[PDB]
Write a protein that binds this ligand. Sequence first.
Ligand SMILES: Cc1cc2nc3c(=O)[nH]c(=O)nc-3n(C[C@H](O)[C@H](O)[C@H](O)COP(=O)(O)OP(=O)(O)OC[C@H]3O[C@@H](n4cnc5c(N)ncnc54)[C@H](O)[C@@H]3O)c2cc1C
Ligand SMILES: NC(=O)c1ccc[n+]([C@@H]2O[C@H](COP(=O)([O-])OP(=O)(O)OC[C@H]3O[C@@H](n4cnc5c(N)ncnc54)[C@H](OP(=O)(O)O)[C@@H]3O)[C@@H](O)[C@H]2O)c1
Length: 389
Amino acid sequence: HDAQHPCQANVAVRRELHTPASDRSCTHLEFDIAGTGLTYETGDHVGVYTENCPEVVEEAERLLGYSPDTFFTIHPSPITVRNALARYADLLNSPKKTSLVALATYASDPAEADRLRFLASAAGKDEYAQWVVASQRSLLEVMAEFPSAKPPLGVFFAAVAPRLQPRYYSISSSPSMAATRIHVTCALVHETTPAGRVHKGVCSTWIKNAVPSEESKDCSWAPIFVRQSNFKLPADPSVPIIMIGPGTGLAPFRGFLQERLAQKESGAELGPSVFFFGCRNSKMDFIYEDELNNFLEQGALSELVLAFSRQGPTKEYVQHKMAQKASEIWDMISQGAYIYVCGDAKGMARDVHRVLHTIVQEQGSLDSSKAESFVKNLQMEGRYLRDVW
Ligand SMILES: Cc1cc2nc3c(=O)[nH]c(=O)nc-3n(C[C@H](O)[C@H](O)[C@H](O)COP(=O)(O)OP(=O)(O)OC[C@H]3O[C@@H](n4cnc5c(N)ncnc54)[C@H](O)[C@@H]3O)c2cc1C
Ligand SMILES: NC(=O)c1ccc[n+]([C@@H]2O[C@H](COP(=O)([O-])OP(=O)(O)OC[C@H]3O[C@@H](n4cnc5c(N)ncnc54)[C@H](OP(=O)(O)O)[C@@H]3O)[C@@H](O)[C@H]2O)c1
C-alpha cells in the first residue's frame, strides 16, 4: 500500500536557494519520510498535494454563494465547502468546455446562458481558444463574467471544477545519502496572464512558505507519494554520462551526484561525468554552488560547465556551451555515454535537442536525415533521456 494514494509527510527543512540579491526565488524542501513505507530511487519524482491560497478560496465562495460551514460528502467522513475549495477544487485553471456546459445550465440570465453555450459550442471554438485558453482565464474569472451561473454544490465539484492535481517534482536527493528525507528543489512560479491576472503558482507558493520542523513543531505537511521514473543512472558507473539541466533542471542531477558519491566511497572509479548547468547570474541564481564545488572537489562530477543567461555581456545558454565542447561530447557518445536533459521543455529542451542534431554531424559527417535517425536511435537504446516539463 501507500503509493497510489498519499502519505502524510511533514516538512523537515525549507530553505531559500537564491541569494537576497536575486529578484526570483527557489526553495529547498526536504520531506521527512522516517517511519513511513515510502521508498524512492535516484531519478524518481515526488508527487505533492497542496491547497489553494486563502484569497483564491475567498473569491470562489463569493461567486458560488455557498455557506463555507456546509458539510458535504465529496464523491466515510464529510468536509466543509471551505476545505473542499482548498484541497480538492482546481480553481485557477481554465474551465473545460464540459464545465462551461454545466455552468450554462445554471445561468439564469439568457445572454449569459447563450454566451456560455456558445463558448462551449463548435461555432465558438475559435473564441473559446482565444478568450479562455489563450488568455489563461481561470474558472474564477469566467464565473465573474457570468454572475448568473450559480451551479449547485454537487454540480460544482462533479462538473465545473476538476480535482486539484498533485504537482510532481524531481527528487534532488539520493537514498544512499539521505534515506530518511525526500529532497525537492522548487522554483517560485509567479506570472501575469495575458488577461492581466497575477497568478501565484499553487504548489510552488505553498513550498516557498512551508514551515519546517527544523524551526517549529507546528511544521507544515503534505500528502506525498513517489512515482517510478526511467530517469536513471547507468548500472555500470564506468559508463560516461552527460547531464544538461540548467536552472531548476539541476534537481535530478543533484541526486545523481549523491548516488555515485555515496557509491564511490564504497565503490569503483565512477568514470567521466560532465554536468552542463546554466543560470542567470553568479551572485543570484547559482543554486547549490558549494555542494557542486564539493562534488567536483571529491571527483563525483568530473567536469562542470556553466553558461550565464544574464550575468555576462554575452548572454550564454547551455546549448551554446555544448557547441564549444561539441567534439568532446561526440567522443563520449562514441564511448557509450548516456545523456540526460532536464528542465524547461519548450525552450531549453528544444534548443538542446537541436544542438544535438547539429552537433553530431560535426564529427558524425551525417546529413539531417541521417543525424535525425542516429539521435533517435540513442533514445530507443535508452541512451538519451529527457525529464522536461
Ligand atoms: C517531472 C517533473 C519534474 C518537475 N520538477 C520540478 C522541480 O524540480 N522544480 C520545480 O520548481 N518544478 C518542477 N516541476 C514543475 C512542477 O511540476 C509544477 O508544474 C510547478 O511547480 C508549478 O507550481 P504550481 O503548481 O504552483 O503552479 P500552477 O499554479 O500549476 O501554475 C503552473 C503554470 O500555469 C500557468 N497558468 C496560470 N494560470 C493559468 C490558466 N488559467 N491556464 C493555463 N495556465 C495557467 C502559470 O502561468 C504557470 O506557469 C516539475 C514538473 C514535472 C512534470
Ligand atoms: N516564474 C517562472 O519561473 C517563469 C516565468 C516566465 C517564464 N518561465 C519560463 O519557464 C522556465 C522556467 O525557469 P527555471 O525555473 O528553469 O529557471 P529559468 O528562469 O529558466 O532560468 C534558467 C536559465 O535558463 C535560461 N533559458 C531561458 N530560455 C532558454 C532556452 N530557450 N534555452 C536555453 N536556456 C534558456 C534562462 O535564461 P534567461 O532567463 O536569461 O533567458 C536562465 O538563465 C524559464 O526558463 C522560462 O523560459 C518561467
